Amino acid sequence: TYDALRRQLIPSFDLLYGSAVSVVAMSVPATARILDLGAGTGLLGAALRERLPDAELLLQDRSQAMLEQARQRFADDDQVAIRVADHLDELPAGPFDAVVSALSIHNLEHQDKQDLFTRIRKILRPGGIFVNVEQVLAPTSELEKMYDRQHEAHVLASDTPAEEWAAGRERMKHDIPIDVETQIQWLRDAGFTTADCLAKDWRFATYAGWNGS
Ligand SMILES: Nc1ncnc2c1ncn2[C@@H]1O[C@H](CSCC[C@H](N)C(=O)O)[C@@H](O)[C@H]1O
């Protein structure tokens, strides 16, 4: 029901979440330590667990209500832990092989995003990876309208309940997105040696930074 609704609301769900899982699996060992930042109900963590049965997952979010859904999802998983913390709070020490996030960091002020990327690099092993599945802003107001039309086209084609899309729109009024190339450059500024946009469907993109490679 919830997982079904996320697919209705998010264009190219399988491509974007799948790209995050694939780039992690090609970058870290089977026994990787992975932090999911803003894990919510643990959808990205769940996608990673499907590919990496031996990975240790730490799911972090500020919302206990969202993390209760993650606890239920991972009830029988002995290699999953949960941490309640804001992105702006001290990160867990790690070190981590991967830090991943989906549709969470766009909630922060731009300065706090730039600082967060730097703080993430500090808890990554050398050669570690940061991956973000993100809601991104178009580089112009005219393109932003086209991004919006493409998002709405997916939502309508997916037979999304009108009430859930209306609720989606209200949530998006408080979002602080920026264009994908600005954020990717912030990874370079944070001291990641490589940063790339792996996959994109207009408003939604999967990008990554590597801590040494
Ligand atoms: N400043 C902040 N610190 C921590 N978590 C935050 C946050 N701002 C938003 N969040 C969390 O980010 C999540 C956004 S929804 C995305 C959930 C999950 N990553 C998924 O892919 O489905 C929510 O769980 C919300 O509580």
Numbering used by the authors: 17 to 229
What does the paper say about this structure?
Conservative asparagine replacements in the HHD motif resulted in CysG variants that remained active. CysGfl-D191N showed a 56% decrease in substrate turnover, while CysGfl-H122N and CysGfl-H123N were fully active compared to wt but were inactivated with EDTA. Strikingly, the CysGfl-H123N variant showed 91% of the original catalytic activity with Ca2+, whereas Mg2+ and Mn2+ resulted in only 50% residual activity. Analysis of the complex geometry in high-resolution structures, X-ray fluorescence measurements, as well as metal-dependent activity assays with the CysGfl-H123N variant indicate Ca2+ as the intrinsically bound metal ion.
